[PDB]
Amino acid sequence: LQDQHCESLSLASNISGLQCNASVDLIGTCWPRSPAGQLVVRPCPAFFYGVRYNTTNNGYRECLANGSWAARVNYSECQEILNE
């Protein structure tokens, strides 16, 4: 279900090798397929589970420069937006 949505998220890639699989990593975020060695930047959507959450910053999942995924998505960007 998610895979196809994550895979088809980009469509018409035609990457002759060296790329990451378009699916989920940690949270319910659909990451598209990209060539190996690419700063896959894309923050979280508006509202998360039960809160708006910050959506001004742009996090990056990073596409492993070989044929896999990275360890840091820098999702921290999506933090709380309350006044104390």
Binding site: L26, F48, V73, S76, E77, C78, E84
Partner: protein, 38 residues
């Protein structure tokens, strides 16, 4: 001369933001933790 306030006030300064942060611990933390971790 060497002057400082926050350094000594930290005791209450941290508690202030720390205590008020509780609201973001019971539930928010679960999201932020995942977000920050991700």
């Amino acid at each position: 001369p060497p002057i400082s306030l926050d350094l000594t006030f930290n005791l209450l300064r941290e508690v202030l933001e720390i205590a008020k942060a509780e609201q973001e611990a019971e539930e928010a933390a679960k999201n932020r933790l995942l977000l920050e971790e991700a």
